[PDB]
Amino acid sequence: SNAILSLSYRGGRLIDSSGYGATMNVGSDVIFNDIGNGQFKLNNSENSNITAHQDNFSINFWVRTPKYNNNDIQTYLQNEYTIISCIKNDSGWKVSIKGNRIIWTLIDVNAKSKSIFFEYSIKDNISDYINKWFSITITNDRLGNANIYINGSLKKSEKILDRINSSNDIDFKLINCTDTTKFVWIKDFNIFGRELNATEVEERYKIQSNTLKDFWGNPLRYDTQYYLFNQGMQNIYIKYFSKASMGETAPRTNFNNAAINYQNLYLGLRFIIKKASDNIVREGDYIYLNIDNISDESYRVYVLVNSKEIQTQLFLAPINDDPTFYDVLQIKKYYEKTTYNCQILCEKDTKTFGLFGIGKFVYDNYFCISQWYLRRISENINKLRLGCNWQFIPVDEGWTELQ
Numbered sequence: 001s002n003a004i005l006s007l008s009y010r011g012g013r014l015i016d017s018s019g020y021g022a023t024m025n026v027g028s029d030v031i032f033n034d035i036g037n038g039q040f041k042l043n044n045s046e047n048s049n050i051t052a053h054q055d056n057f058s059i060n061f062w063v064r065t066p067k068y069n070n071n072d073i074q075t076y077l078q079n080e081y082t083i084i085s086c087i088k089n090d091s092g093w094k095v096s097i098k099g100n101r102i103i104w105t106l107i108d109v110n111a112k113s114k115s116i117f118f119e120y121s122i123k124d125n126i127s128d129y130i131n132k133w134f135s136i137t138i139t140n141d142r143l144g145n146a147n148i149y150i151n152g153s154l155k156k157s158e159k160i161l162d163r164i165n166s167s168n169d170i171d172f173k174l175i176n177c178t179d180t181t182k183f184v185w186i187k188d189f190n191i192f193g194r195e196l197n198a199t200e201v202e203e204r205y206k207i208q209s210n211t212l213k214d215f216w217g218n219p220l221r222y223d224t225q226y227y228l229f230n231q232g233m234q235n236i237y238i239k240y241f242s243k244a245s246m247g248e249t250a251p252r253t254n255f256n257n258a259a260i261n262y263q264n265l266y267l268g269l270r271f272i273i274k275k276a277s278d279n280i281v282r283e284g285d286y287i288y289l290n291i292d293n294i295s296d297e298s299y300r301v302y303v304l305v306n307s308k309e310i311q312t313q314l315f316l317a318p319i320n321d322d323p324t325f326y327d328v329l330q331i332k333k334y335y336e337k338t339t340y341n342c343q344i345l346c347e348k349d350t351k352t353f354g355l356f357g358i359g360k361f362v363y364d365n366y367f368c369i370s371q372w373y374l375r376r377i378s379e380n381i382n383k384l385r386l387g388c389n390w391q392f393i394p395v396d397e398g399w400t401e402l403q
Contacts, residue, residue, distance in 0.1 A: 005052060005170070005191040009038035014050065018191075023053040035219060039187040042083065042172060044180050049173040055142040055164075058192040059084075059104075060204065062135045064185035064216070065097060066398030068122060072179065073259045076100075081177035083184050084170065091165035095138075097184065100130075104138045104148060108162035116146050118155050125254065125263040126234045131398040132340075133187070133217030135205055139195045152205030152338070154198055183398075209338040212281050212331060215265070215393040217340055220281040220331075225292065226271045227393040231341050232386030233358055237268035238367045240294050246313045247367030249358060255402065264401050265393050269293065269316070271301075273392075276328050288327050289344075291316060302327050303346045303353050303369050311359040311370035326353075335382040341389040343373075355388040 007024075008017040009032050016022035017037075029048035031041040042048050061084075068076040080098035087094060090111050096103045103117040118136070120129035128134070137149035147157040170191075174182060188208055196204070212220040215229055228238050236249040252263035270293040276286040289301040294316070302315040302325035315325055330345045344356035346369055355373035358365050373388040375381070 001192060001194045003190045004057070004193045005054060005189075007050075007052070007189040009034060009040065014040070016052070020054070025049075025051040025053065036187060039185055040172075042174055042184045042186070044174050044177050044182045046173075049171065051172070052170040054168050054170070055144065056140065056193075056195045058137060058139040058194065058196045059093075059095070059190075060135070060137045060192070060196075060201075061189040062133050062187045062208070063102065064131065064133045064398065066183065067131045067262075067400070068099070068260060069179075069400075070255065070257065070260070073257070075179055077259065079176070079178050081182075082173075082175035083186075084172055084189075085175070086167045086170045088165040088167040091163075092167050093164070102136060102148075104146065106140070106146070106164055108164055110162050112162060114160065116148055116156050116158050118148050118150050122259070123256075123261045125252070125261070127262070130262075131216060131396060133185075135188075135208060137196065137201045137204070139201075141195045149198075149201045149205075152202040154201075206338055210283055212283055212333065212342055213340040215340060215391040216396055216398075220273070220342070220392060222273050222275055222279045222281055222287075224272065224279075224394055226273070227266050227268060228271060229265070229391040229393055230358060230387065231389035231391065233365075235263060236358075236365075238358075239268045240291075240316060244313075245315055245317055247316060249365045249367075265399065266395060266401050271392070273331075281331060283331065283333050285331060287329050287331055289329060300327050301329070303329075305348065305351075305353070310372055311354070311357075311361075311368050313359075313361060313366045313368050314356070316367075329356075336389070340391050342391070343388050344390065356390065357388040359387075 003018050005022050006017040014024045027047040027049040029043050029045045033039050077099040080096050082094045082096045085094035086092045091107050091109045094105050100122045101117045101119045103115050105113055105115040107113040135151050139147045144160055145157055148155050214220050235252055238247040239250040241248040254263045269291050272290040274288040274290055276288050291299040297318055299316055304312045305326045306324055326348055332343045332345050346353040354369045354371040357370050357373050359368040359370055
């Protein structure tokens with residue numbers, strides 16, 4: 001139904017947008033930003049805290065938690081710490097994190113507890129969860145079922161048990177975390193006074209998602225260094241091929257040990273998005289793609305305008321005024337609009353050159369532009385043809401790499 005409580009960071013202050021007038025107490029070691037409305041970071045200190053002073057309800061919020069430290073994996077796996085709690089006389093509810101698990105716990109007046117959790121892999125080459133914003137929704141009823149939804153989709157649902165106390169305070173704070181460097185990002189925290197159904201959860205997800213985002217789920221920005229990720233070919237990156245003035249694919253390198261495995265992200269061409277015509281890139285903007293790690297001089301992505309082929313290799317070159325090439329691009333989000341993917345179009349202007357992708361040429365796979373990606377092969381084509389879907393990866397503190 002209607003939010004009992006909703007945290008928003010409006011104009012320098014954390015408030016309750018609920019209209020229920022919750023009063024907020026904020027420690028001195030909390031970091032805020034005004035992205036969306038907005039975001040806060042809990043560090044591992046007693047001074048990094050927020051208190052909201054206020055059998056069927058729902059909890060919804062998005063969370064961003066940092067990648068494990070390769071050399072501190074047993075701490076990551078074994079240390080469960082509370083992040084959000086509503087407890088009184090040892091009874092109530094808490095949200096906790098234990099490594100790659102997010103955990104919901106109900107505790108009765110006798111200290112008898114039962115938990116439900118969501119676990120994501122820490123062995124996949126590419127993760128939709130590690131260090132990335134993702135939405136969680138927990139519902140609970142009197143039947144009684146507890147459900148965990150992740151990114152709008154039901155992931156778990158279990159029963160069931162004495163009485164569970166209700167508290168006037170909700171504490172946002174790391175409890176029992178043993179890594180002094182730990183932090184957690186939270187946004188869009190909401191409480192509902194009823195059990196939201198599967199349809200209600202999906203819709204609130206789509207709503208809480210026109211904004212172009214980066215790989216981590218934050219707004220995409222101009223003048224920011226980004227590595228490039230391809231949704232259709234996730235296990236390669238784009239590398240400058242000196243002999244040809246092109247981008248060729250290369251296999252991502254990886255790291256693995258006994259407990260974990262991942263492919264490296266900070267590889268290949270490093271791009272900067274420039275305004276062609278604030279610093280947030282919006283759907284449909286006209287942009288250039290600069291590349292700043294090929295040499296001392298700036299390079300840029302060019303489209304061969306006088307090609308009659310279906311697909312053409314993109315020309316990665318020093319800045320020039322050669323009219324046989326064109327550098328004005330448009331970043332778009334044609335579909336899968338809740339994801340962090342985007343497409344790159346070039347048009348000039350009654351003439352469409354296609355979308356950026358990866359194509360087979362005389363053979364190897366090259367960073368290219370192709371009309372193939374605009375073909376309306378079938379109504380579901382966009383679910384099958386993923387090579388024109390890209391994400392931009394900035395270096396982020398929650399994801400560190402060797403070398």
